[PDB]
Design a protein around this ligand. Structure first.
Ligand SMILES: *[C@@H]1O[C@H](CO)[C@@H](O)[C@H](O)[C@H]1NC(C)=O
Ligand SMILES: *[C@@H]1O[C@H](CO)[C@@H](O)[C@H](O)[C@H]1NC(C)=O
Lengths: 50, 48
């Protein structure tokens, strides 16, 4: 799952079967780590208008 | 693929199904790749 963002600690408690979390835009908000098996919350980068 | 979803619920109703809401979690996915059109429950006898 390729992406670009800031990875933060996720308060969300995923169910054991669940590995991904999809926002209203069908883009992964959070992903369950494939090595340490924890939940990481993806947030987009600080885009802005100049 | 054979998907088995299951849920265990503690109830205290004597006869019929209780009325309520309980979403079934997915338990196990089986790579079987076979045709299935019929099923049968397996019970256990009690011998004395
Ligand atoms: C290997 O993966 C398992 C779970 O998939 C994890 O518990 C374990 O810590 C991992 N080992 C290393 C060295 O990352
Ligand atoms: C699956 O079994 C049914 C019952 O015999 C049969 O009608 C059907 O053609 C079978 N399908 C395949 C893909 O074998």
């Amino acid at each position: 799952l390729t992406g670009t963002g800031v990875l933060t600690e996720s308060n969300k408690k995923f169910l054991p079967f669940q590995q991904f979390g999809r926002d209203i835009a069908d883009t992964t908000d959070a992903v369950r780590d494939p090595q340490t098996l924890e939940i990481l919350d993806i947030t987009p980068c600080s885009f802005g208008g100049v | 693929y054979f998907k088995i979803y299951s849920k265990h619920t503690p109830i205290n109703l004597v006869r019929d199904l209780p009325q309520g809401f309980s979403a079934l979690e997915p338990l196990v996915d089986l790579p079987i790749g076979i045709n299935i059109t019929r099923f049968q429950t397996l019970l256990a006898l009690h011998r004395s």
